[model samples]
Target: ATFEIVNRCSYTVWAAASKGDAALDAGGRQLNSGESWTINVEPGTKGGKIWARTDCYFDDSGSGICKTGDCGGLLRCKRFGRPPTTLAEFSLNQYGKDYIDISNIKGFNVPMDFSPTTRGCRGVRCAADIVGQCPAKLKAPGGGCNDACTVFQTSEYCCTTGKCGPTEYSRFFKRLCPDAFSYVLDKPTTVTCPGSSNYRVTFCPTA
Candidate 1:
């Protein structure tokens, strides 16, 4: 299967993705507004995620920085993107379907749209203005907004070791973007489609 990454915003976006043990595919690439890139994934590629890095400054050696979603300072990421990132996560070929979700559980850096090209499959998106209206305690340096779990790191906010449900912090994000994964227990965020279907991920999709 394949995924089309589209940049529909007003500025360039550094796109990134993580795959299972198979060298992160296009972990780093600059896509100007209106540009698009398509990546082919092997069959049964499971537990992969796609995201965008913003305000990057990399050198010829593929080393530099990103204001948001920085992956260990490596232009070519070998791990998941940093916090305050908007994530489009997927698991392919599980029980004859592909599970996908747009997650803000780690907080939001940019707006995103994730949809399937195949018919009969529904789509999910989180295109809200999270950064502009981010709460003061959840604001990240340079840019973007942080999730309460990331900022507080406490049992009440993060629910690290105990059974936890939606807190006021998670509810805040849910109210803004009901389609996204607002917290660890956000069950409604998940969506399923035929594993054979290709997908599209757009940055800064129009409302």
Candidate 2:
């Protein structure tokens, strides 16, 4: 599958992709505001995740840390990043189609849109300003907003069991980002499209 990722934020973002052993974009790439990168992952790649890291600086060896969504010291990421992340997830060539989604389940660092560039597929987004509106307990030290489940880790917010409903915290995210998953067991969050469709992920996406 191919992805055209754009960093539309006013700040710099070190965008990353993980899932499948072979490094795509050498694991990560740095994009300044308004910059974009196109990445290709060979067919049958599943459980792929993409996100952006912020407020990061690296040494000559590219060994350093990112305040939000840092995978490791390397500019090319090899692992899933820490949370307070806005996720663009996809399963390429899975079964009969491609499964795509935008997730706020890890909470939100930036607004995003995951849209198919072809096939006339439905797009999904989480473009609300959750960071500025975050509650004290759910606030990440790095300035992103953490979800209640990640912060509290209780059965109520975590949905540890099968039976769970929206809480105030989840409601907060849901109201702001209705198209993305705000909690475990969220509804109608997945969008399926033909494998031939190319996709675009826009950070700090406009509604």
Best by TM-score: 1
Q: Least accurate stretch of 10 residues (summed lDDT) in model 1?
A: 19-28
lDDT per residue for candidate 1 within 81-197, as digits (tens), equals 788999999888887898889999888998999999887588998988889888888999879999998898888677777678998889888988999989887767788898778
Angstrom error of the Cα, residue 47, model 2: value is 0.7
Cα lDDT tens digits for candidate 2, 73-180: 777888888888899988888776888998888889988899999875799988878888898889998879998888988998888887788889988999998989
The per-candidate count of clashes, in order, stands at 0, 0
Q: What ranges in model 1 sit over 4 Å off?
A: 20-22
Q: What is each predicted model's overall lDDT from 0 to 1? A: 0.86, 0.86
